[PDB]
Ligand binder design. Structure first.
Ligand SMILES: NCCCC[C@H](NCc1ccc(-c2cccnc2)s1)C(N)=O
Ligand SMILES: NCCCC[C@H](NCc1ccc(-c2cccnc2)s1)C(N)=O
Length: 426
């Protein structure tokens, strides 16, 4: 029937003055654009079919051609950014918004998907979708007492599109729109479907990726306890954005950070800091580096939870990117911690792994580690313990690492190195 037409025959059908011929040609176009092996999107675009597909969106009296052009357009809008642009230039945004209220679920869902792909392309199109008024009718599709009554695919689709309306930066989405979407988002974040939970978490991670006022409008909604719960999930597609969202949130105020701790996040981190997935361990360690940049009493909760040994571990052995995050976590810990917190740190074995990373061929981490070492000598000075400390560093081969760095490419390490030698070593 409509399997494997050429673009030429699709054009002749769509150009005919016969709605049924048009329907059959549009279905042919839809199937062509759906094939796995390199969909001929650009030939379709070049043929001038997007405006006709768009006009078909408006034919209330022929729902199957509405459905078929929507799907065809959706295939094009899910391609490259130039292909998505072509669809927007064809007038598709408001035509799809009008289809959200279609009595046919398959057509409504198709409009939901199309809008998510358009909004998901970038900030400008995101904000353009919002200006045309997509948010009210999208939220209205979720206005039922129990989300469980909605079809699984429908709900996943709606959640995914809502998360694209939350997604990009420069600029971030409008504050007005964020506030409008958030209560539905909070609701989806407790919905029992792994894909809905994942996309909800992604949406939260986007919204917390910015200044503290952005973080705050999310945190005030009370979601931190649910985020922490999801942080312990067994499904990696759930943990990954929950952890991103949590990581974003502790880049905020001491108060915002405390809420993460109060909700019990720190209990999850022995597993996160030893997670077999590299990016989870990395982001967990990044999250910790921001927690140790906090108040002394928050450093103390990290101590209390037995997390310092796990930080020593990540520093000792991890993907190098992870070890760089661990290095930051230590410098922040040592800059803000009490003398006795820094003593405890050394008692857990931080010195040797710290010195071993002075071998790394990256300047940034060397300055971070030198920084940390200086902080620890500062604690040792107030205890008159600099010699006991110097010996420790000497015995594990830390001295040879440091004087090597006087004769080093960059200036601020030479300088920082030289100070250390002259000051605490003979
Ligand atoms: N809730 C605290 C927000 C902390 C911001 C920062 N603290 C120093 C750093 C935090 C994490 C940093 C980092 C840098 C590079 C790689 N990984 C972590 S710096 C600061 N001194 O205002
Ligand atoms: N140099 C760019 C501007 C300052 C860099 C600093 N730290 C940047 C980061 C590098 C490692 C980070 C990280 C790691 C894993 C996941 N997400 C972020 S932060 C920051 N405050 O941003």
């Amino acid at each position: 029937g409509t399997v494997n037409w050429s673009v030429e025959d699709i054009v002749k059908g769509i150009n005919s003055n016969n709605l049924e011929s048009q329907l059959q040609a549009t279905q042919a176009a839809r199937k062509l654009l759906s094939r796995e092996k390199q969909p001929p999107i650009d030939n379709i675009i070049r043929a001038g079919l997007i405006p006709k597909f768009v006009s078909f969106l408006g034919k209330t009296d022929c729902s199957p051609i509405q459905f078929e052009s929507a799907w065809a357009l959706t295939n094009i809008a899910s391609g490259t950014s130039e292909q998505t642009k072509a669809v927007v230039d064809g007038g598709a945004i408001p035509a799809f918004i009008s289809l959200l209220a279609s009595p046919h679920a398959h057509i409504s869902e198709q409009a939901v998907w199309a809008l998510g792909n358009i909004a998901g392309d970038g900030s400008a199109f995101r904000d353009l979708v919002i200006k045309h008024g997509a948010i009210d009718p999208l939220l209205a599709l979720l206005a039922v007492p129990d989300l469980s009554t909605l079809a699984c695919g429908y709900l996943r689709n709606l959640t995914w599109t809502l998360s694209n309306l939350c997604r990009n930066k420069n600029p971030a989405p409008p504050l007005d729109a964020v506030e409008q979407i958030l209560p539905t988002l909070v609701r989806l974040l407790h919905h029992n479907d792994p894909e809905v939970l994942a996309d909800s978490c992604w949406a939260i991670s986007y919204l917390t990726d910015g200044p503290n006022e952005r973080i705050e409008m999310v945190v005030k909604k009370g979601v931190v306890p649910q985020l922490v719960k999801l942080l312990g999930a067994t499904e990696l597609p759930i943990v990954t954005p929950a952890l991103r969202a949590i990581g974003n949130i502790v880049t905020g105020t001491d108060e915002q950070t405390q809420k993460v701790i109060d909700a019990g996040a720190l209990a999850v981190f022995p597993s996160l800091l030893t997670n077999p997935k590299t990016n989870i361990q990395k982001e967990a360690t990044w999250t910790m580096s921001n927690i140790t940049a906090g108040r002394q009493d928050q450093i103390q909760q990290v101590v209390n939870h037995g997390l310092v040994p796990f930080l020593v571990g990540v520093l000792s052995k991890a993907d190098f990117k992870t070890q760089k995050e661990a290095a930051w976590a230590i410098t922040n810990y040592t800059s803000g911690g009490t003398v006795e917190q820094i003593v405890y740190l050394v008692h857990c074995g931080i010195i040797e792994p710290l010195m071993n990373l002075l071998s790394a061929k990256d300047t940034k981490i060397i300055q971070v580690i030198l920084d940390a070492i200086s902080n620890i000598f500062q604690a040792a000075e107030k205890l008159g313990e600099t010699e006991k400390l110097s010996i420790m560093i000497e015995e594990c081969g830390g001295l040879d690492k440091i004087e090597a760095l006087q004769r080093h490419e960059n200036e601020s390490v030479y300088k920082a190195s030289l100070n250390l030698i002259e000051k605490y070593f003979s």
